[PDB]
Amino acid sequence: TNNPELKFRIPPPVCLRDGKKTIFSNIQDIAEKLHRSPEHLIQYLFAELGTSGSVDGKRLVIKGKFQSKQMENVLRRYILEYVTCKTCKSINTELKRENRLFFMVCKSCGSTRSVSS
């Protein structure tokens, strides 16, 4: 009754490698289709890879060298361990701040897991 559909909502990360530069436009779409706020996602991307740039426009402009496969892989890791829980298939969970860190909670279930780093 509740879940007739029982992720399939990952936007294909179509990137741009302009040699010295790299532009990722899909950053907002992957922010939406994964129900993820933009700033936390982009800081996690910067924490995975020690490269520096800016955010331009609804896109991420990082001046460094990476194939689309490797940034795709980094997004795959973030998808594997943040947007969807390993134990059960779900995605509607989002960031919350339970005594200073980011403590995750869910909506479909009501989880309380301490994932911050």
Partner: protein, 470 residues
């Protein structure tokens, strides 16, 4: 235009509130279901057992709504050494019209005497059939003293099995055998993961679980599929608890006693010390009705070593500041429910794991500390908790003289040495003090594979006493 807080108030006072307990009620006529007892304290202790990292705090939270919270930064995520406590109020709908499976409702400890039915279409209210306490037992293969002691507290059992994982979880069987050791039958089997299986897989898992329960002492265990995360099928769990599990024999005849499992210093930091509070022993009472203002003695207490290496035992005399149970301060204490006995003791006794598994007696009784204990043991065929990859689960050997082993005497977690081995009898010498009151059902664990491993049960038959220094 009423605020949600105004709505919840209006319902709370409409539900009768939480009436203050009488200061001196006639205790001869009091039953555990009495209105003064049932509304403000928990009379039955239910304990959760399960495999590691499957969810036993979450099931309790889904039942009652009281968080175990989990603490100690590093321990926020892996495992928690201390037990997890929560109070649930069992409410049955007074309307027969509503379906029987969903009439039951487990609420938090702050609910009213008769809250309204959340079922859309029923104006009937909820009657309180019982209040229950929950003792979350850690289920790790290293942490064994706390699980045995929390068992030694509780009176009802709750087994969790995950479906998609392998059927024969070994430490779940270890939990079940530990429960069987202390003389409990009332065990309810839970299927934690049911949404994530198919129809055929769930039935196969049920068949496996049934195939496991044929040789154990427990035979007619109820099995019910629940979900700690999805938070459904809660009412029927309350149904099974109410029907299957009655109140253990507990009246006011037996002399007063306490068994402390947790210690809690009450020192609110940042606050000035001129406004402080005593030290609180988190203890369970199996026998004894305790009233606001009492002198009690922690029998093993101060444990000293003299210049000559002899262990001196100084009981911790103490006057009870308060008996914190459930939500509010209570005038009297009910046997069969964990309570924070706050006393004049210096909180440095209740800061760390210091009062974990220690016997207490009010003034007017003289339990005996011992140093050598005669023990009557009996072992099982194989060790529980080792996933041998297909080869003959390890067989228990016969005990050797002079071997350090963990002997859980009731709640006390002690490491004793065997001084003699007989056909069914042994003698244990203790360096960590232990007292004997009546029988104190005992669990035995050895060190064969690094961490402790349960082997068999035992009961004290005799012992060499020590006289406390006054």
């Amino acid at each position: 235009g009423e605020t949600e807080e105004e709505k919840r108030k209006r319902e709370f006072e409409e539900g009768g509130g939480l009436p203050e307990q009488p200061l001196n009620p006639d205790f001869s006529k009091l039953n555990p279901l009495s209105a003064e007892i049932i509304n403000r304290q928990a009379t039955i202790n239910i304990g959760t057992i399960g495999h590691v990292a499957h969810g036993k705090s979450t099931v309790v939270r889904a039942i009652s709504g009281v968080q175990t919270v989990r603490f100690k930064d590093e321990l926020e995520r892996n495992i928690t050494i201390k037990l997890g406590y929560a109070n649930a109020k069992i409410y049955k709908c007074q309307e027969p019209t509503c379906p029987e499976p969903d009439c039951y409702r487990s609420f938090k400890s702050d609910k009213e005497i008769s809250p309204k039915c959340q079922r859309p279409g029923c104006p009937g209210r909820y009657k309180l059939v019982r209040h229950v306490s929950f003792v979350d037992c850690p289920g790790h293969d290293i942490l064994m003293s706390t699980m045995l002691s929390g068992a030694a507290v509780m009176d009802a059992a709750l087994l969790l099995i995950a479906g998609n994982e392998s059927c024969p979880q070994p430490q779940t069987s270890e939990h079940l055998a530990a429960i069987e050791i202390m003389k409990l039958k009332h065990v309810i089997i839970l299927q934690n993961k049911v949404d994530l299986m198919r129809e055929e897989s769930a039935l196969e898992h049920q068949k496996s679980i049934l195939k496991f329960i044929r040789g154990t002492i427990a035979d007619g265990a109820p099995i019910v599929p629940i979900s700690a995360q999805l938070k459904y099928n809660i009412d029927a769990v309350n149904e099974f608890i109410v029907k299957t599990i009655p109140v253990p024999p507990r009246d006011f005849m037996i002399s007063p006693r306490l068994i402390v499992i947790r210690s809690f210093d009450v020192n609110k930091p940042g606050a000035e010390i001129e406004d402080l509070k005593g030290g609180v022993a988190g203890g369970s009472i199996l026998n004894g009705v305790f009233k606001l203002g009492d002198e009690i003695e922690i029998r093993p207490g101060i444990v000293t070593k003299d210049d000559k290496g002899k262990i001196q035992c100084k009981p911790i005399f103490s006057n009870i500041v308060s008996l914190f149970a459930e939500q509010n301060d209570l005038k009297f204490a009910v046997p069969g429910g964990l309570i924070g006995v706050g006393t004049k003791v210096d909180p440095t006794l209740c800061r760390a794991d210091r009062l974990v598994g220690q016997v207490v007696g009010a003034k007017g009784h003289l339990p005996n500390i011992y140093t050598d204990i005669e023990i009557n043991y009996f072992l099982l065929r194989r060790l529980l908790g080792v996933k041998t990859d297909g080869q003959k689960q390890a067989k228990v050997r016969k005990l050797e003289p002079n071997e350090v082993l963990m002997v859980n005497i009731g709640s006390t977690a002690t490491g004793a040495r065997v001084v003699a081995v007989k056909a069914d009898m042994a003698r244990l010498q203790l360096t960590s003090p232990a007292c004997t009151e009546i029988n104190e059902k005992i669990a035995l664990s050895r060190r064969i594979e690094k961490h402790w491993r349960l082997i068999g049960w035992a009961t004290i038959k005799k012992g060499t006493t020590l006289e406390p220094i006054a």
